[PDB]
Amino acid sequence: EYDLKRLRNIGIAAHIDAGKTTTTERILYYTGRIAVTTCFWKDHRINIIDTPGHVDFTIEVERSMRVLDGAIVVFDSSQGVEPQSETVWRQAEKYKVPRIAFANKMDKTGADLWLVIRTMQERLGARPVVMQLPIGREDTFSGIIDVLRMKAYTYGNDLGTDIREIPIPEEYLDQAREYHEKLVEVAADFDENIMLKYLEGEEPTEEELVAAIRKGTIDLKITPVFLGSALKNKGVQLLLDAVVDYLPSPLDIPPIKGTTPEGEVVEIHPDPNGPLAALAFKIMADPYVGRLTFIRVYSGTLTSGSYVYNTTKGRKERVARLLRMHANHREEVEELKAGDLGAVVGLKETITGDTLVGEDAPRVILESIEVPEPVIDVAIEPKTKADQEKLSQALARLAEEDPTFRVSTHPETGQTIISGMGELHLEIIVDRLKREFKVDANVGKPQVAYRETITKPVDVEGKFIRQTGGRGQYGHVKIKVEPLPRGSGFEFVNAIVGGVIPKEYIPAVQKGIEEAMQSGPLIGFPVVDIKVTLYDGSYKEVDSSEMAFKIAGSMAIKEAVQKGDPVILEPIMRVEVTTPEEYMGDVIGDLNARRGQILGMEPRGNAQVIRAFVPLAEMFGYATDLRSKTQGRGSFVMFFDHYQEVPKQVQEKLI
Ligand SMILES: Nc1nc2c(ncn2[C@@H]2O[C@H](COP(=O)(O)OP(=O)(O)O)[C@@H](O)[C@H]2O)c(=O)[nH]1
Ligand SMILES: [Mg+2]
């Protein structure tokens, strides 16, 4: 039943509209006749892993690529590797994932196989090796020639229900012999035994070839290529074969790496008997069973009805059931062994990124712990409260699956404000808002979340003394406000000596300080990184109140941040641009005019990779500035890094 060798853990990467969904639907179908979906082909368990909706989704991508072992990259035979198709490739390259390739849509007009092969060779530097030729051109496209084995299959309809092996037609007999030769010439690069047979012109054996091509695929040197039309059902069974021949099992890729509690790195082996280590990569809210938290298992066995320690978060979780999702049904299983993926039921306080271990087995983490700061805000004016009522429920329901964002109510516009770690993040949340959770609102343009703070210690005071509301009000506080090292946040001390301020009012003061740190004086963004010591004041015996000392506190914070040489803090993003070698300096220059700070350029593949420190505020609509400077071919990722005082002229320009 469970045999690692015969496990094939895959995802499908493709341009948008290239054919990922159709190809996936079609695979499921063919493996039918008897977040992570499971099926069987020729005694192999193929766990198709769902790869992000768009490639820019950078956090999900990284995580969904160490959850898979090998990938199928799908190109539109009409257009070639369309500049975003280069970008999905760079992904696989980046995460060192063994891959095959699939020239989809060989049935449409414009479908050129050779365009794909060439563009793969030239642009991506991929080393395609042709493993089949198409019999036919457009609508004429009817057959597919396996040049490894020198056979040919023909398709008697566009339904998937008539595949007959035929000899290669003599019209394609030259071309096939030609490409078989190329294949055997390649295979010999990875098998010495095949080298001494290619000399002799002694046709080596299918075992040898397949093994050789495979070794090459898995060690990231070659990229076999197959074609077909997933829509008109041709080539999807051979593509499925390909998965089982050339794509890696968990035994084939190097073991994932994990961090002990002492910052140390451990290599983590697929030994199904050894300790347990799982990584959770998606949470979903299934109707018939509640919340499913999908995991991938690296070592040991995860047994249904058992307890696992969540090393990311400190608690234990109850593994109630274990599931496998199939195309058309679910399946309860007793265990998921090392090399496998499923869903688990139970697990109240487990979220994605988190690491599940064997309870009394070594505590290791598998990702980074730090939380991306909420660096981009968006305002939404809800409809007529009839939407707010289902908005608010949804937004708080959004945070049952996602803790990487914050919800606030703006101190002085009334609006509801979402905060995230980038724009796309928010763009997809709004997507889930007006559709999935059905909500409507006047959405605002995304903006950078700045922060204020003071650069020098001050010693101010606050007085509120009025005859409002019928009675007499009075509250007097004196504070010392001093700057706190970056990222330290807030600190309050009470140092009031002896009823100088009546104990009842100290809370009211604090509230006042708190409610007024929410709007700095430079641009009305939250004050941060300061220490507030309440050290004096006065009351008037009947006139004082809570309202009074609230405002007094508030009025002294507004003073302390005006006198303290206030400065604005901006978020500084860590940027990695992937560009073809040619645009290097023409791209570096553009980063350098964004107040960037180049940290060094090493090459990845044939492309090059620049590292920088560009501030978030010099980045809005960056992707269209890359596609203008890289002939469409470049791309970039972006992560928070640190807040930095704005430079003099940017302070002035932001006021
Ligand atoms: N002509 C043709 N069209 C295809 C083929 N495969 C997919 N499509 C088209 O692609 C569209 C859906 O694309 P999809 O599979 O979702 O690609 P994705 O955007 O990468 O997920 C459908 O409208 C299909 O008409 C094919 O083999 N031939
Ligand atoms: Mg799709």
From Swiss-Prot:
The keyword Transmembrane does not apply. Pfam families: EFG_C, EFG_III, EFG_IV, GTP_EFTU, GTP_EFTU_D2. GO terms for cellular component: cytoplasm. InterPro entries: EFG_II, EFG_III, EFG_III/V, EFG_IV, EFG_V, EFG_V-like, EFTu-like_2, G_TR_CS. It comes from the Bacteria. Transmembrane segments: none annotated. CDD domains: EF-G, EFG_III, EFG_mtEFG1_IV, EFG_mtEFG_C, EFG_mtEFG_II. Belongs to the TRAFAC class translation factor GTPase superfamily. Classic translation factor GTPase family. EF-G/EF-2 subfamily. Catalyzes the GTP-dependent ribosomal translocation step during translation elongation. During this step, the ribosome changes from the pre-translocational (PRE) to the post-translocational (POST) state as the newly formed A-site-bound peptidyl-tRNA and P-site-bound deacylated tRNA move to the P and E sites, respectively. Catalyzes the coordinated movement of the two tRNA molecules, the mRNA and conformational changes in the ribosome. This is Elongation factor G. It comes from Thermus thermophilus.
